[PDB]
Each structure stands twice: as C-alpha cells, then as structure tokens.
Design an enzyme around this catalytic site. Structure first.
Site, PDB file in Angstrom:
ATOM      1  CB  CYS A 155      -0.844   0.046   1.329  1.00  9.23           C
ATOM      2  SG  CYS A 155       0.161   0.034   2.795  1.00  9.23           S
ATOM      3  CD  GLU A 212      -3.696   1.775  13.130  1.00  7.61           C
ATOM      4  OE1 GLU A 212      -4.812   2.380  13.053  1.00  7.61           O
ATOM      5  OE2 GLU A 212      -3.292   0.991  12.281  1.00  7.61           O
ATOM      6  CB  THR A 271      -5.690   2.094   9.435  1.00  9.31           C
ATOM      7  OG1 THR A 271      -4.496   1.349   9.862  1.00  9.31           O
ATOM      8  CG2 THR A 271      -5.585   3.509   9.959  1.00  9.31           C
ATOM      9  CB  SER A 298      -3.374  -5.985  12.120  1.00  4.21           C
ATOM     10  OG  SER A 298      -4.793  -5.797  12.383  1.00  4.21           O
TER      11      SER A 298
HETATM   12  C1  LIG Z   1       1.201   0.420   9.181  1.00  2.80           C
HETATM   13  C2  LIG Z   1      -0.093  -0.325   9.004  1.00  2.80           C
HETATM   14  C3  LIG Z   1      -0.344  -1.341   8.115  1.00  2.80           C
HETATM   15  C4  LIG Z   1       0.578  -1.943   7.102  1.00  2.80           C
HETATM   16  O1  LIG Z   1       0.724  -3.360   7.324  1.00  2.80           O
HETATM   17  P1  LIG Z   1       1.501  -4.028   8.590  1.00  2.80           P
HETATM   18  O2  LIG Z   1       1.364  -5.528   8.348  1.00  2.80           O
HETATM   19  O3  LIG Z   1       2.867  -3.472   8.580  1.00  2.80           O
HETATM   20  O4  LIG Z   1       0.736  -3.474   9.890  1.00  2.80           O
HETATM   21  P2  LIG Z   1      -0.672  -3.966  10.476  1.00  2.80           P
HETATM   22  O5  LIG Z   1      -1.660  -4.407   9.379  1.00  2.80           O
HETATM   23  O6  LIG Z   1      -1.145  -2.788  11.292  1.00  2.80           O
HETATM   24  O7  LIG Z   1      -0.316  -5.111  11.419  1.00  2.80           O
HETATM   25  C5  LIG Z   1      -1.188   0.160   9.979  1.00  2.80           C
HETATM   26  O8  LIG Z   1      -1.830   1.298   9.200  1.00  2.80           O
HETATM   27  S1  SF4 Z   2      -3.135   3.121   6.866  1.00 10.03           S
HETATM   28 FE1  SF4 Z   2      -1.774   1.271   7.062  1.00 10.03          FE
HETATM   29  S2  SF4 Z   2      -2.543  -0.216   5.553  1.00 10.03           S
HETATM   30 FE2  SF4 Z   2      -3.499   1.780   5.172  1.00 10.03          FE
HETATM   31  S3  SF4 Z   2      -2.128   2.656   3.498  1.00 10.03           S
HETATM   32 FE3  SF4 Z   2      -1.455   3.447   5.527  1.00 10.03          FE
HETATM   33  S4  SF4 Z   2       0.183   1.931   6.006  1.00 10.03           S
HETATM   34 FE4  SF4 Z   2      -1.065   1.050   4.477  1.00 10.03          FE
END
Ligand SMILES: C/C(=C\COP(=O)(O)OP(=O)(O)O)CO
Ligand code: SF4
Length: 309
Positions: free
Chosen positions: A12, A126, A167, A226
């Site tokens: 993303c 987060e 998120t 997550s």
């Molecule tokens: C930074 C982020 C998501 C990107 O994937 P990640 O797998 O790094 O993190 P998450 O899904 O929160 O465990 C939370 O917005």
């Molecule tokens: S909020 Fe988390 S999953 Fe969504 S674009 Fe930002 S890093 Fe990626």
C-alpha cells in the site's frame, strides 16, 4: 490447477513510503539506523533491513544519544514522541499519513476533555499509538474490540462522545461494532463510516472476489500483520481453506493436492517478490499460468520527506 491472483494485493502507499524512509536513511547516514518497532510487519522486509544495518527497538531507552530514530508506519504515542524529543535524537517519522489523520482527531478530543472510543485490537502498536494521543484525565479514552465490549462500556458524558478506528480492521466486523455504539450512544460522533483505510477495504473486497472462485486461498503476510490476518480470516469465514504464509517454503502439498482452483493474495506489508515465489511453487505443484482477477485500480502515493530524498 488454476492459479488466480487477487487485485489489488500487496504494498500500500504507507508501507512503500515507510520502507523507503528507512532505506534512504541508511544510504544517507549509514548504519546504524534505529527504528522503533518493525517498520512494517513483514519478516522478509525486516530481516533485510537488519542486514543493511537497521536496528529495531521497542523502547527509546535502547537508543544511544546522537542516534537517528525512525518511527514505524504504525505510529507512536505522544509519550514515546516526547521521550524521543527530550533525548538528543534525530527523528524521522514513517507513520502512515492515514494513521496520523486518526491521531489528530484523538488529540482534539483530548484537548477538549471530551471522551473518545477506539475500535481496535488490544496490544497492537497502532492501537497503542492512537490511544496514546489522549492524555486528559477529565475526559476518557476507551478501547472496544467487539459489540460485547460496547454493551459493557459506561462513559462519563455520552452527550460529548466520539469514535475512531484502527486502520486495518475487518470491514464487516467494524460495521457491527459501530451499529452497537450508535444504539448504546445515540449522540456519538464519528467519520461518515470509519477510519479503515482504502488499502484495507480494497484488499478485503479483492479477497472476497478471489474466495468466491478459489477453493483454497494463500495470503502472503507475516503472523503479526493485522491487515494480513483479516484477509485469511475473511476467506475462511466464506468456507474456504485459507493459510497465512511468509513465503513459498511454508506451503504444504496437502493444502493444494487435487485442488482445481487456488487463489493468492498478499497483505499490505508483503513485497511482490514473495508472491512471485509463491506462484512459482504452486506451478511446481501442478498449477498453470497465474491469472490476475480484475480489480479496483489504486493510484495514491505518499512521498518520503524531502530531508530523505
Ligand atoms: C502500518 C499499518 C499497516 C501496514 O501493514 P503491517 O502488516 O505493517 O501493519 P498492520 O496491518 O497494522 O499489522 C497500519 O496502518
Ligand atoms: S493506513 Fe496502514 S494499511 Fe493503510 S495505506 Fe497506511 S500503512 Fe497502508
């Protein structure tokens, strides 16, 4: 065996930005570069950055004076930020802009002494960083993970109440939680829908389409991701066997033996090379050319800060 690929899938805008921040800092300043928490939740990415001299720590105490510190894409609390600021550290922030958006709303409610409720999963970084934007003892900051949590929550002043979300949540389950919040607290205020980002919503919609064709779904992503777990979970609830895997080596032949249609997707933190290797393994197991499903075209990009370009 037919191999289908979900679209969208993989990186993303926030993950691509955050990884580039760390890579660029290593090229500019050299090793070591301290990073608070895994920059993104992917073992392959993290392991590689370690290799190149990034050091991943949980607490600011672990970082020597004079160091360069990068906050992970998941965000950090004001306490952590201020602790970093009180120290003689050079700081770069890789928090994704879509997480920062939520943080700003929490800080606003905190300044007003007005209570807020966060929908999310306890213990996740987060959630620690977003809950950590609230510091007014007059008001309150509460975490709910389910409708049952809402059913049991009491607040001081439900006339001045607002909500936010993590998120990367399940779109469907968050909807249930919000329904409960509105029944319990009819004056509660929030965004039009929730704070689930475009990438989470799009990957979940894509895995839904994938699972309606595939008997088995492989989700490339680490155990602590997550958003990645939400993609396996969704396919499983549709009655398909779904496995969360870090790479092609995790594939057990039994999962796909005699399977006519296998689907592959990847969480927001998983590099495309891992998906290519997974496809290569499925092919050696009898699969043909990988077919990309039609999907929502994504066009957002977040640039690294100028100081790191
Ligand atoms: C930074 C982020 C998501 C990107 O994937 P990640 O797998 O790094 O993190 P998450 O899904 O929160 O465990 C939370 O917005
Ligand atoms: S909020 Fe988390 S999953 Fe969504 S674009 Fe930002 S890093 Fe990626």
């Amino acid at each position: 065996m037919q191999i289908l690929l979900a679209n969208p899938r993989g990186f993303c805008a926030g993950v691509d930005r955050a990884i580039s921040i760390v890579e660029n800092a290593l090229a500019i300043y050299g090793a070591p570069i301290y990073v608070r928490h895994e920059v993104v939740h992917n073992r392959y990415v993290v392991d590689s950055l370690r290799e190149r001299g990034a050091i991943f720590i949980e607490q600011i105490s672990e970082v020597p004076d004079g160091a360069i510190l990068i906050f992970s894409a998941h965000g950090v609390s004001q306490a952590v930020r201020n602790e970093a600021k009180s120290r003689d550290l050079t700081v770069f922030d890789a928090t994704c802009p879509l997480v920062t958006k939520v943080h700003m709303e929490v800080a606003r409610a905190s300044r007003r002494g007005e209570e807020s409720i966060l929908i999310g999963h306890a213990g996740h970084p987060e959630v620690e960083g977003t809950m950590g934007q609230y510091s007014n003892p007059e008001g309150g900051m509460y975490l709910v993970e389910s409708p049952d949590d809402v059913w049991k929550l009491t607040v001081k002043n439900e006339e001045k109440l607002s909500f936010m979300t993590q998120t990367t949540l399940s779109v469907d389950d968050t909807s249930d939680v919000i329904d409960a919040l509105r029944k319990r607290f009819p004056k509660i205020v929030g965004p039009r829908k929730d704070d689930i980002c475009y990438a989470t919503t799009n990957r979940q919609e894509a895995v839904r389409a994938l699972a309606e064709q595939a008997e088995v779904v492989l989700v490339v992503g680490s155990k602590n991701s997550s958003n990645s777990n939400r993609l396996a979970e969704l396919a499983q609830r549709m009655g398909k066997r779904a496995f969360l895997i870090d790479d092609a080596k995790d594939i057990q032949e039994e999962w796909v033996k005699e399977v006519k249609c296998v689907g592959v997707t990847a969480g927001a933190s998983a590099p495309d090379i891992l998906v290519q290797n997974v496809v290569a393994r499925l092919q050696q197991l009898g699969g043909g050319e990988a077919i990309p499903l039609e999907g929502r075209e994504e066009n957002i990009v977040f640039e690294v800060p100028k100081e790191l370009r």
